[model samples]
Target: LQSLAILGATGSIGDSTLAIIRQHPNRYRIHALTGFSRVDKLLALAMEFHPVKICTSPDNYAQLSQKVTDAGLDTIILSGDEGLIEIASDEAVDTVVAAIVGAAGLSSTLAAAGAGKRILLANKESLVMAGDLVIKTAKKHGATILPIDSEHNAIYQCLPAAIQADNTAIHHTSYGIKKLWLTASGGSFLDKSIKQMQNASVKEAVNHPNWSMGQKISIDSATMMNKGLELIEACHLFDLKEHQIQVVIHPNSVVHSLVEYVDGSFLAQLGTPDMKTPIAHALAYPERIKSGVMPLDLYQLGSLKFLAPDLDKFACLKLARYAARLGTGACIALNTANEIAVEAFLAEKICLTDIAVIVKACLDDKTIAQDYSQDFGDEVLGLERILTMDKKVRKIATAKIKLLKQGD
Candidate 1:
């Protein structure tokens, strides 16, 4: 049986991954699982999967111990980042699913890469924050990193492995691909005017048209920031230039993404809007497996449409490209600002439109260190630097949100 370690076992991606594993119990086993603060859910998963170990970020280790004992499972429970690091680099794990969201996921993702395991990458921030560092570590450790995001996975499927290894050679091919077309479903406010967007509620923002995901990711999808982060991720994964990637607005979402050749031939990957398909693809690389997900019926889905993304309406995608061009630190700043703004919006302290405004303001600040070329020089970022910069950007973002709210 293949041993797998799921870093974020309680999130949407984690749940979907578990569902697939549940179907193929004889083929795979859950070696380890980790969560942030959901102790009850973690205990339930532990009882079901009977993993060798469990890790959590809760402070009360004794409480977790009691819960594990009550569940009648003989699993080791470790706590905090130290615990997560241990599971991420475990020697027995062959496949590591890096699905933990936000900046918090970066460390464990790197740890898995350093351990030289097959990495199923779902955390975009790991690449966004430090693309160079993460990729470099993977190369040094001989890790096989696969894309789990739908767009990146589509590009991975469409392009030849030789071309993926050397993108410059793509120009020599007859197809001569010009741009990678990333399709977006154009979130909840695609039909609403700019004025109508000002009063958009959290419920409306979280209501995704095609995919069912967590609230934060659903909101990011509506704002198109998720697409922006994916653009950055594609650049790193494929080693493509900024001009080579293009975001196309396709409301149908049937065409996950496409690769345009120089000869005008575009290769596209089409399937139902289910996360399990890509997760299964990553799980069985160079091979196909039964994921138990529903197959797409083209007869029922008659027509598919594609269009250019509205840069004016959705500025987050544009900002992400700008940050990608600027440097790695700029991408980190952009993600930091988005995280804070999204939290505030979720709390009803800010409007949906303010999300971009806050990110823009954080980008404007010069104190967060925009030096992309600076070698962090073997010095890990201490809690002081991370928390301080986070606080500084949040303050700037909060001010921008307040100003925008007053003007509205």
Candidate 2:
């Protein structure tokens, strides 16, 4: 049995991961589990799985410890980033599900890579912020990174067998690979115009047309920033150039992603919309397992539509591409600013369209350029440098928000 350490055990991705593990009892075992603020959910999972160790945020550390103690379970409790790293790099963990969202997930992901564990990467920011470093470290340390994000996993599934086996297939000319295609669901705003989007209420913005998701991701989907972030991620994961990948607006969401060959043929991975399929695929590589996702029924399927993205409406996507072309530092600034701007938009402090504006402002700022230059833009000098740049970019974004309010 492969021992698993789930880094974000209380989130939706974590829920999907555990569901798969439940099906194949003899194939997997829980070594560690972690949650940020959902102590109750984390505790409930602990009671069921009885992991060797459980990690929680510092704020809930004592409360979780007491609960575990009272339950008479022998599971060790850990808290904070240090706690996360300890479990991630622990010797007993055969596979690490790096599912924690945003920048908070970066450190443990790097730790797991440095320790040479098989990483099921659900955290996009780890590569977006420090792709060069993470990919390099994984190669040097023998860590096998399997993409867990649906689109990336789909792309991974479509790749040739040789490249699939070689995680660092940086150059694929010999493989006859032409380009990678990422299909987007076009989100809730696909049918709406720019005027409608500008006045879109928080509820309208978050209510996705297809998949149920958190507010932040739903908003990113609407703005196409999530896909933009994914673009940056695809660069690192597949080791390709920014221009090597293409994005297409696929309203159906049935075709996860696709790959183009030099001979005018395209390969795609089609599936019913479910996170479990990708998670299970990563969990058991070179071997197929039942993901528990309902199979797609092609007989009853509707017409599939594909179109080019309206970059004018989804400006954040254009900004993300611009960032990708600029390098890793620009990618970091773009993502950090978007997060801060999304929070402000959720609070009704700014218009729905203002997210793109704020992110663009941060990207164009002289201070951000200088800060990224401290570590040579694309080079991942270290996590300290990335975090410092992230903090500075956040401040720049917050300042832009004030200016936006003043203009209003």
Candidate 3:
């Protein structure tokens, strides 16, 4: 039985992963599980899974401790980043699911890679912040990193295994592949005009057109920043240059992603828009297993259509591309600013367009870290710099919102 460590046990991905493991108890063992706060929920998971270790942030430990003890679970309760790191780098665990959202997931991801565990990478911003470092660490430790995002997972399925063989394989496919097309459902604003987007509410923005995801991710999708981050993630995960990848608006979302080969042949991975499919794929790679996801019915879904993304309406995607091109710490700064802007927008303090504007401002204002190699050492420094930049950008973004409100 493979021992698994789940880093974010309370989120959607964590829940889905546990559900899968619960169904096939004979195949997997739960070593550790963690979440930010959600003590009641975490307690329930601990009682159900009976993992060897359980963790939460220190702020919630007192409450969590009672629940853990009350449930009579033998699971050891730990707290904070240190606890997370311990579980991630545990020698007993063979598989590590890096599902914690945002930059906070970076340290544990690196730890898992350093420990040479098979890493199921779901945290995209970790790549956005320190892609070079994470990739280098995985290589040095001989860790197998699987793409957990649907788009990257789809690309993994469609692209030849030869392309994933080595860094050099990317160049070979780059010549033949016209474009690495990433499909998007265009979020909740697909039907909204540019004028309507000027006043897009957080409720409407978080309501995704096709898939169900976390609130932060749902907002990122509506803003198209999620796709942008995914594009950057694809570049790092697949070792492709920015020019090799492109984005398309596929409203149906049946085509998770597509690849165009040299022989005018396009390969696509089609499935119902479910995160569990890809999560299960990462968990049991080189072998297929039932994930309990609904299979697609082509007849029920009349037709699939593809169109160019509306750059005018959704400028966040363009901003993401710009950050990717700018190099060095730009992607980190943009992602940080985007996160803050999304939060502010959700709070109804800013307009939807402010998301792009704030991200752009942060990218423009920050200085890229020169002499930064993509290796582990430089990557750590890059993360520190990005965190600093994120704070700076959040202040500026929040100020901009205040200014906008003042004018009104």
Candidate 4:
């Protein structure tokens, strides 16, 4: 059995992953799980899986402990970042599902990589903000990282077996690879006019047309920044530069992603727009298993339309490209700043249009960028250095966001 520890055990990716595991008791084991603030949901998951251990925020430790005690469960309870790190690196966990969102998930993910765990990566921030560090760490530690995000996972599946094993130089002519094409659902605002999108309500922003996801990701999807973040992630995963990965607006979500070859071949993975499909794909890498997801009907898949993304409308997409060209240092600043901006949008502190603006302003702070670019460099991208840069960028983003308010 593949013993597992799901870092974000209470989120959508976590839910889908556990659902698949529950379907195949003989193949998987829930060794451990970690959640954030939802003690009740975390408690429920702990009860169902009866994992050897469960972890949560320190603030919720008491309530979770009380409930576990009341239920008479023997599962050990761990708390906070320390607990997350311990469970991630624990020898008992053979596979770690790094699904936790935001920078909050960064530390434990780093720990998992350092421990050489087989990582199913769902947290884009881990790669977006610290791709150089993460990828290099896994390589040094002999860790295998399987992509759980649909786009990257699709690319992973489309590549030749040898390339998948070591994508350090995927663009090498030996791979016969042309470039990767990442499909974008174009989010809920795909058809809406720019003026319409600027004034979009929170509900409209999060109302993804294709997949069910958390609010934060859905917003990123609406702004098409989700695709941008995925673009950066694909570059790191495949060892390709930003330009090597092109984003195509395909609203169907049926064609998850694509890989083209110099020999005039384009391979793609098609399926129902379900997180379970990709999650299950990574959970059982090099082998196919029942994912509990329904099969896709080819005939019924209406018109599969593809269009060029309107960068003028989604400025974040262009900004992401800019950051990628500037190197990982800029990408780290972009991811952290975007997180702060997205959070502000969700809180109604800023309009939807302001998200990219805030990120750009923070990125334009050249002194800060050049200063921290050193830490985010190939040899220096550690947890402490990453945290320092993340803090600095978030602060620059916050102050710039406040300036936007004052000018208005």
Candidate 5:
């Protein structure tokens, strides 16, 4: 049985993962679950799965502890970053679900990688912020990273066996791989024009037409910035250049992603739209099992569509490519700036469209990027530097937001 440590157990990804866990109780165990908000959900999950332990912010720890006590449960509670790190790096936990969203998840994710845990990575910021460091640490420590995001997982499924084992295969000519295609559902605004999207409300942005996601991710999707982050992620995960990975707009969301080979073959992983499929696949890799997900009936699904993304409309995507070409620090700036800008938009301090503008402004210089250049040892790219850069970038982004508002 796999002992799982689920980071961000209160979020949507966590919900999908836990749903799959319920389907196969005998095969897996919830060793630890960590969350920042939504103590009620965490408490109820504790009552159900009876995890050995749980972790959350110190502010919420008391409330969660009371809920556990009220239910007469024995789940040990840990708090703050140290708690997250402890659960993540626990030797007994066979699989660490690094699902916490944003830069907050970075340190614990690094700890999991350092400890050589079998990590099912759902947190994209870990890669966008410190991809070089995280990948190298996993390799050095014998950590196994299984992509839980649908797109990466699909690419992982489509690649040749050797490439699947070692992501560097894509970079080598021996793999005969041409390029990878990361599919985007185009978010809630795919059909709408750029002008129409400018007036989008926080509600409109988060109500994803195809998939359920967090507020931040939903906003990222609306801007097509999620695909941009995924682009950098695919580049790192599969060991390919930014130019080698292409993004295609597929509104149906049936084909998660594809890997095109030099041998005139385009390999793709197709299934109904559900996060559980990928989560279950990662949970029981090398062996297929039910995901509590209904299999897709090709007959019932008549038409599938694919289109080219409008670079002008999805400026965040354009900005993503720009940052990626510059290097990791630029991508880190891109990711962090987007996070801060998204918050500003959600707060109505900026328009929905200002997300791209602010991120673009934030990526103006290479100062932060220089700290994470190729020569900087991946060892130095640890928590302190990562968090320091994160704070620095967020501050810059916030300043840009105010200036942008002033211009208005």
Candidate 6:
């Protein structure tokens, strides 16, 4: 059985991954699990799986430790970023599920790469912030990064075996790959006009039509920023230029994503809009396993439609492409600003449309522009640099949000 360390053990991705493990008890073992604030859920998982160690935020470390001790469990409890890195790089961990949201997941994800552990990547922000560092570290350490997000995982399945084995191999002409096609659900505001989106409530923004996701991502879906972030991730994962990947609106979400070959053949991975499928696919690489998810009913799907994303409606997607062209620093700034803006929207401090406005304002800031202009090609960006850039962008974004609030 392969020993696993789930970094964001309380999130939805972790839920799906553990579900698969529950089905195949003989094939997997939960060695370590980490959660930020959901101590009760984390403790419950530990009670069932009997993991050797569990990690939580520093504030909850003592509480979780006491609880574990009271329960008569033999689990070790660790906390904070250090604890996350230790679990990710543990010698006994065969796989690390990098699922923590936003920049919080970056360190452990990189640590997993550095340790050469099989990384089941679910955190897009890690790549958005430091794609070069993560990919380079993985390559150097012989670590394999298998993307578990539905879109990337679908694209991963459609690629040739050689490219799947080595993501950098896509740069070679022998692969016969022409381009990648990423599908977007067009979000909750797909049918709503820009005017409607400008006035959307927090409830309206998070009400995703097809897939159930966290509020931040749900709002990202509403703004199509999720697809934009995915575009940046595909560039690093597939080693392709920004133009090589195209994002199309597929409202049904049945066709997760598609790949185009040089010979005009289009390969696609279609399935029920379920995270379990991709999680199971990554867990049992080179083999298939039952995910306990329902099979797709093509007959009910009836039809799948695709369209061009309205740039005016989803400016975040456009900004994402611009960042892709600028370099990794710009991508980091873009992601940072989006996180702050999304949080503001979720708190009802800003209108839904203000998200893009705030992100655009931050991108236009001189401080962020200076960072974006730095040449990141010569060397791998250090963690300190990435975090500093994130902090700077957060300040700029917060200032922009403050100005907007005062104007309100």
List TM-scores for all candidates, in order.
0.93, 0.97, 0.94, 0.97, 0.96, 0.98
Question: Which digits, one per residue and each the tens of the lDDT, describe model 6 over residues 133-162?
Answer: 888888889899999989999999999999
lDDT of 5 at 367: 61
Instruction: Report the candidate with higher TM-score, 1 versus 6.
Output: 6
lDDT for residue 115 in candidate 5, whole number 0-100 = 95
Residues 207-312, candidate 1, lDDT per residue (tens digit)? 8888988777888998999999888998888767678898888888889999987677899998999989999988987887887878899899977877788888
Candidate 4's displacement at residue 48, Å, is 0.9
- Which residue pairs of candidate 4 clash? none
* Candidate 5 C-alpha lDDT tens digits along 301-369: 989999998999899999999888887778878999999988788888888888989888788755655
Q: Which has the higher lDDT value, candidate number 2 or candidate number 4?
A: 2
lDDT of 5 at 283: 88
**Model 4, runs deviating above 4 Å:** 377-381
Q: How does model 3 score by TM-score? A: 0.94
Q: Candidate 5, which ten residues in sequence have the lowest lDDT sum?
A: 369-378
Worst 10 residues of 3 by lDDT: 368-377
Residue 218 Cα positional deviation in candidate 6, in Å, after optimal superposition:
1.2
Residue 162, candidate 6: alpha-carbon lDDT: 93
In angstroms, the error of model 3 at 203 is 1.6
Off by over 4 Å in 5: 366-377
How do the residues 75-150 of candidate 3 rate in per-residue lDDT, one tens digit apiece?
Answer: 8988888888899999899999998999889888888888888989899988887788888888888888888899
Question: What lDDT is reached at residue 194 by model 1?
Answer: 82
* Residues forming the 10-long window of minimal summed lDDT in candidate 4: 372-381
